[PDB]
Design a protein around this ligand. Structure first.
Ligand code: FAD
Ligand code: SAL
Ligand code: FES
Ligand code: FES
Ligand code: CA
Length: 1297
């Protein structure tokens, strides 16, 4: 047959013309309008698209449930399966416990990921009714969240396993019986033998083989037939490497390729077995068999522990991992280094082989003949006197690509410690999986002793050398790892020999080298949130200062909250796709649409010619809407393809051929300095006398810190929907932005119509953090022009690779400091020269650099200081705002030389800091008096509650007992100024309406992206009008209701809008008091009607502007801030000196948010900001080619904090009794300040690294270089030792920007 049949949320679905290229994600959103399931990457790493799927296991005669990635599952593979999505488990009317909990525990912010996480937890509970705290966490390996900081999510879900922010005592019980039945129709079908299905598509044919005979026969007749199972590999090739296999064939049904046979030599799994099957089956073996027969099994298991996540492993097969033949495969190494027996069948033919250097001929190739297919794999039992180990190291533990992976085996002569057989296989060292065929033989018969260790290391170092210009980069780090892995193996093997009586022969192991053999250990979380209780009085209706859940939590948790792309398409609507340059600075000589036009559905290709009025946009008018004559960065927008479906828009854009003539490019900060290529003159602040200050300097340190950039990674990429009104140049735009005003102004200026005609509407954003403060417009305008030219509605949702490439991000920094200080610690002179890489457009760069300079002093009084800034005009995607807006960069530099001051002085950091810290009443370097100073209490409470001193000791102790595992514990302070650097942007407006039924419709200039701004504004209004929040509502933000609004940024949004909403509300109360006075206790509904029937207006606007702001650089005077945010973080880490990986063991925060408008919201903002910082300083790295082209374009190569990447012990506390009167209800901004506190982790790692360096004889300087981010690479290399030494022996892949 050719009719695809399956279920979704219970309802049957029959598809008569299924296209192999159609993914369950597209079929759910665009063919069933089920939009709970989101699209965050289409790469497989965020899990926003997670959905459960069920089916009847023919074999086990049972129904099974497992999660999967909708973005990668081809529907042509879902025949006779039951899909379940977030919508299918609950609604706001009837929330499923999973949804209720995540929502109430505050686990949802922007909400764009809650459906996926909800589904992972849901799927778990369907498999394990009462999971363990550990099982719960493993559920989220394939799920990423950028707003929550993961604490709440897990704390909330904890309740399912084994004052206050919420109450699990109120959570509704779970009832497994009340879950969606399993489609009886599907059980009726399990009675008739499945047959072969064929699905013809627009350009791809898919055959679903049902029997081995069919499969081999098909391969025989058409060897070209591409096999597909989980598609987790092929899916990526088609989607990202622009591949197209016209003839697929899925054999997932065939029994043979699914059997698990227990043989004498070991367990044989069919080539199609899901990695989750292998995982579960082996896990049972290593639990009932002698530890001596499960060495290899446990090796595989260790790899799978960090192999994608639940979603991928549920469909990814073993055979797929084998045949993919990826040099970075984490299983081929283990399979080769253990001689796995692979069977290979073909119609008529049948052979068998063992994995070895011969199996992987060249790049991604194997022994298999074009017509053969991998039948099965036998994972061998470990023989007595045989030991195995598996290693893997990347940039992040959870779901990542290995930099180096390895499988190591050793077989000793019976009863001895003499090497009978030794295999060492690696991944990430060549264009394939290799073995140390040379090094290992020269080790036969030798004994497991220190001499062999030296023999191998020297051998590996020689045999596995890398070309400095080798692909991937990080040459040193990788080499070190091959050696560091073997070292762990050597130390491990010893322990195993000792644990066999031959202890005496191999020799006891140093009790400080033991930890170096340990496998990664979990250790249960322990969080503690602390905030103030609202006065004993405060009526229960006054929610200001109460932990009120984000108003949209339930909706976000249920998939009903709507996001731009969720809005349905007009039958009308067209799709748009941007066309960017592939040259950093060329001259466009010719554009060719010839091919684009052949694409079915092609409407047109917009260029600079098609712009009605002006082609000059951007916050400083130095940018083009569409490149004209020359491109000035890779990812520069040249045009826009317009077609019906997004699929055709893309294929068409690919048909737009361009020709260039390159020009001198200015890629790096250096390139810029050498070319005097900047954005304006240099900014400078200076107080005191430098020469004089340096003269009195006992010490004087110089240095250069470099801070990497950072991609915002809002789960919801950029999206705009433009609907043309047909008359007067009227246009409504549904946009994911934090800046309606400029989105509007840019579309107006671009079209040639007044702002009169343009309306921009923002309901909510799935995260923004400054990335949508002005860069969204680059998409907005393109669509506006598509609408204005077709008359039809046009829409554009950017894919991740396009968003990351195009939208820019945080500013990379280069500091050149020279601090002068006394032996006492006291600093007396500072001089920093910052250099930010601005990019293609000025944008907000120069204002970011002004913020940096404003915080180069972090928390310290420095009598003689002078900082300067220069913004580099480079041929790269222009960079913008990012939570912190230059503040972190400027503070990381400050805390860097500060740390080196402590070291050089030999004094304890805490003391060096407390000494130089500001005092209540001091002026800053820009002369702003610091009144209501509160940092000291944050400091004294943090040391006290985090029990610093005592733990400082426990850390030293741990270090004395551990050689290849060191711990750090650093306490950092921060000072963040609140207000826009541009004074007039400090204004907010609101519009309130009270209808005759009493209900109130409120709106303000600020947008919503996860911060819970509306929730707060609602709480403000509710307290202002003295009526329950239940009667108030905010539906969206738009230029209709409130005009000329500042972008939602600078943490000020709740300060500005909250003040506006307040005034508006006071106007209403004014009007209403005459009626109130008459009937004092009469209901609110009553006063409203009276006012109405008395012709009294029940609608008013509210406005506010921050007073007394205004700073002059020319005279270094005038306060540029309304007030200051204050806080202290105390983090503890524990690095693995042998790999670079580490783990944040504990953090303690004490933040000053004045009288919090909403404790729960703020604490969630503190945790979230922090985790964003922790990623900026230790995980997130962007790599650009030498030619200025970005390489890291998806979560696969950009690793943002994951679930397990957060302080195992997260403690947050809000400073008590610290009312900030001058702000809405004595509160304080809280969105950005908390982010730099993640520094404490950076410098705790600094310590742990120094402690390791201190036990290595060779001095080689004590004040080493540790640039940001402190990735595994930077950390390992910094731990110079016998291994970093024996392996350090242009044309490189990347380059420092
Ligand atoms: C987010 C994410 C994270 C990942 N993490 C990791 C990781 O940590 N380590 C790692 O190694 N991989 C990882 N992978 C890669 C991938 O999941 C594996 O390579 C997977 O095991 C491939 O299996 P599949 O069934 O999905 O293959 P498919 O994509 O269906 O097929 C892959 C290739 O195998 C061939 N093939 C499949 N079965 C057979 C057979 N029986 N006989 C002959 N040829 C066959 C096909 O022709 C095709 O070329 C990740 C992928 C994603 C998307
Ligand atoms: O001044 C700004 O424009 C600004 C923007 C985002 C965040 C903080 C800021 O000061
Ligand atoms: S979209 Fe499918 S994993 Fe992120
Ligand atoms: S709350 Fe999850 S991506 Fe924002
Ligand atoms: Ca810029």
């Amino acid at each position: 047959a050719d009719e695809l049949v399956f279920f979704v949320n219970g309802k049957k679905v029959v598809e008569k013309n299924a296209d192999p290229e159609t993914t369950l994600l597209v079929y759910l959103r665009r063919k069933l309008g089920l939009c709970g399931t989101k699209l965050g990457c289409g790469e497989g790493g965020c899990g926003a698209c997670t959905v459960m799927i069920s089916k009847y296991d023919r074999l086990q005669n049972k129904i099974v449930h497992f999660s999967v990635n909708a973005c990668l599952a081809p529907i042509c593979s879902l025949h006779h399966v039951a899909v379940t999505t977030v919508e299918g488990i609950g609604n706001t009317q009837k929330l499923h416990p999973v949804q209720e909990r995540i929502a109430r525990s505050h686990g949802s912010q922007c909400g764009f990921c809650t459906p996926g996480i909800v589904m992972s937890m849901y799927t778990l509970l369907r498999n394990q009714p009462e999971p363990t705290v550990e099982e719960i966490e493993n559920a989220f390996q394939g799920n990423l969240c950028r707003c929550t900081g993961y604490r709440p999510i897990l704390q909330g879900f904890r309740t399912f396993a084994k004052p206050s922010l919420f109450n699990p005592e109120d959570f509704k019980p779970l009832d497994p019986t009340q879950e969606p039945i399993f489609p009886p129709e599907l059980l009726r079908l399990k009675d008739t033998p499945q047959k072969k299905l064929r699905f013809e598509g627009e350009r791809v044919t898919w055959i679903q083989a049902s029997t081995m005979e069919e499969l081999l026969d098909l391969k025989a007749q058409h060897p070209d037939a591409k096999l597909v199972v989980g598609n987790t590999e092929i899916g990526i090739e088609m989607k990202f490497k622009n591949m197209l296999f016209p003839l697929i064939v899925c054999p997932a049904w065939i029994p043979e390729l699914n059997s698990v046979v227990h043989g004498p030599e070991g367990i044989s799994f069919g080539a199609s077995c899901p990695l989750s099957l292998v995982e579960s089956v082996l896990a049972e073996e290593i639990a009932k068999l002698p530890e001596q027969k499960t060495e290899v099994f446990r090796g595989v298991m260790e790899q799978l522990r960090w192999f994608a996540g639940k979603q991928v492993k549920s469909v990814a097969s073993i055979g797929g991992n084998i045949i993919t033949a990826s040099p970075i495969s984490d299983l081929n190494p283990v399979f080769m280094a253990s001689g796995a027996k692979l069977t290979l069948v073909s119609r008529g033919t049948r052979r068998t082989v063992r994995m070895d250097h011969t199996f992987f001929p060249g790049y991604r190739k194997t022994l298999l003949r074009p017509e053969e297919i991998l039948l099965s794999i036998e994972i061998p039992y470990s023989k007595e006197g045989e030991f195995f180990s598996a290693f893997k190291q990347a940039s992040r533990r959870e779901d990542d690509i290995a930099k180096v992976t390895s499988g190591m085996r050793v077989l000793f002569k019976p009863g001895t410690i003499e090497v009978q057989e030794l295999s060492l296989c690696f991944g990430g060292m060549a264009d394939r999986t290799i073995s140390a065929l040379k090094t290992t033989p020269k080790q036969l018969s030798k004994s497991w002793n220190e001499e062999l260790l030296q023999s191998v290391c020297a051998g590996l170092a020689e045999e596995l050398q890398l070309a400095p210009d080798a692909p991937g980069g990080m040459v040193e780090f990788r080499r070190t790892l091959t050696l560091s892995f073997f070292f762990k193996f050597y130390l491990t093997v010893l322990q195993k020999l000792g644990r066999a009586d031959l202890e005496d022969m191999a020799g006891k192991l140093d009790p400080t080298f033991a930890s170096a053999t340990l496998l990664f250990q979990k250790d249960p979380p322990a969080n503690v949130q602390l905030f103030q209780e609202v006065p004993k009085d405060q009526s229960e209706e006054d929610m200001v200062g109460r932990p009120l859940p984000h108003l949209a939590a339930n909706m976000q948790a249920s998939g009903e909250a709507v996001y731009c792309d969720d809005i349905p398409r007009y039958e009308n609507e067209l799709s748009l796709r941007l066309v960017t340059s592939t040259r950093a600075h060329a001259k466009i000589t010719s554009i060719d649409t010839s091919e684009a036009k052949k694409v079915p559905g092609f409407v047109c290709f917009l260029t600079a010619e098609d712009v009605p009025n002006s082609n000059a946009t951007g916050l400083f008018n130095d940018e083009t809407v569409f490149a004209k004559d020359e491109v000035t960065c890779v990812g520069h927008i040249i045009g826009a393809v317009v077609a019906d479906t997004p699929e055709h828009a893309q294929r068409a854009a690919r048909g737009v051929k361009i020709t260039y003539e390159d020009l001198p490019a200015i890629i790096t900060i250096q390139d810029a300095i050498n070319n005097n290529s900047f954005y304006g003159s240099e900014i400078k602040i200076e107080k005191g006398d430098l020469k004089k200050g340096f003269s009195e300097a006992d010490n004087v340190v110089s240095g250069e810190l470099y801070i990497g950039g950072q991609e915002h990674f809002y789960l919801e990429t950029n999206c705009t929907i433009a609907v043309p009104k047909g008359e007067a140049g009227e246009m409504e735009l549904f946009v994911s932005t934090q800046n309606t005003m400029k989105t509007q102004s840019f579309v107006a200026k671009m079209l040639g119509v007044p702002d009169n005609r343009i309306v921009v509407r923002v309901k909510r954003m799935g995260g923004g953090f400054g990335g949508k403060e002005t860069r969204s417009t680059v998409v907005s305008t393109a669509l506006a022009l598509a609408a204005h030219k077709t008359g039809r509605p046009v829409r554009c949702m950017l894919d991740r690779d396009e968003d990351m490439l195009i939208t820019g991000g945080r500013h990379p920094f280069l500091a050149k400091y020279k601090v002068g200080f006394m032996k006492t610690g006291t600093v007396v002179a500072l001089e920093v020269a910052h250099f930010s890489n601005g990019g293609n457009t000025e944008d907000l760069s120069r204002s970011i650099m002004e913020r940096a300079l404003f915080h180069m002093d972090n928390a310290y009084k420095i009598p003689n200081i002078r900082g300067t800034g220069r913004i580099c005009k480079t041929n790269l995607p222009s960079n913008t705002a990012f939570r912190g807006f230059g503040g972190p960069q400027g503070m990381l530099i400050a805390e860097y030389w500060m740390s080196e001051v402590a070291i050089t002085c030999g004094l304890p950091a805490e003391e060096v800091r407390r000494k130089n810290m500001y005092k209540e009443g001091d002026l800053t370097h820009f002369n702003q008096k610091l009144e209501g100073f509160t940092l000291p209490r944050c400091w004294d409470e943090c040391i006290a509650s985090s029990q610093y001193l005592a733990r400082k000791r426990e850390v030293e102790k741990f270090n004395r007992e551990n050689r290849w595992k060191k711990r750090g514990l650093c306490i950092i302070p921060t000072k963040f100024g609140i207000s826009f650097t541009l004074p007039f942007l400090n204004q907010g407006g609101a519009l309130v309406h009270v209808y005759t039924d009493g209900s109130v419709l409120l709106t303000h200039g600020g947008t919503e992206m996860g911060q819970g701004l509306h929730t707060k504004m609602v709480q403000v209004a509710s307290r202002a009008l003295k009526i329950p929040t239940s009667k108030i509502h905010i539906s969206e933000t738009s230029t209709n209701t409130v005009p000329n609004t500042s972008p939602t940024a600078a943490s000020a949004s709740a300060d500005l809008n909250g003040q506006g909403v307040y005034e508006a509300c006071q106007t209403i109360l004014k009007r209403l008091e005459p009626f109130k006075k008459k009937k004092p206790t009469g209901p609110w509904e009553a006063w409203v009607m009276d006012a109405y029937t008395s012709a009294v207006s029940l609608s008013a606007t509210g406005f506010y502007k921050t007073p007394n702001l205004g700073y002059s650089f020319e005279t270094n005077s005038g306060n540029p801030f309304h007030y200051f945010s204050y806080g202290v973080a105390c983090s503890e880490v524990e690095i693995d000196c042998l790999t670079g990986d580490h783990k944040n063991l504990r953090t303690d925060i004490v933040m000053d948010v004045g009288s919090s408008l909403n404790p729960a919201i703020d604490i969630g903002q503190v945790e979230g900001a922090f985790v964003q910082g922790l990623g900026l300083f230790t995980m997130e790295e962007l790599h650009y080619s030498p030619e200025g082209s970005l390489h890291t374009r998806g979560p696969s190569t950009y690793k943002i904090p994951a679930f397990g990447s957060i302080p195992i012990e997260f403690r947050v506390s809000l400073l008590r009794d610290c009312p900030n009167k001058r702000a809405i209800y004595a509160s304080k901004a809280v969105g950005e300040p908390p982010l730099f506190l993640a520094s404490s982790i950076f410098f705790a790692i600094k310590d742990a690294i120094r402690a390791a360096r201190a036990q290595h004889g060779d001095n080689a300087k004590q004040l080493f270089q540790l640039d940001s981010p402190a990735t595994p690479e930077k950390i390992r290399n910094a731990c110079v030792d016998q291994f970093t030494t024996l392996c350090v022996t242009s044309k490189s892949w990347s380059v420092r920007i």
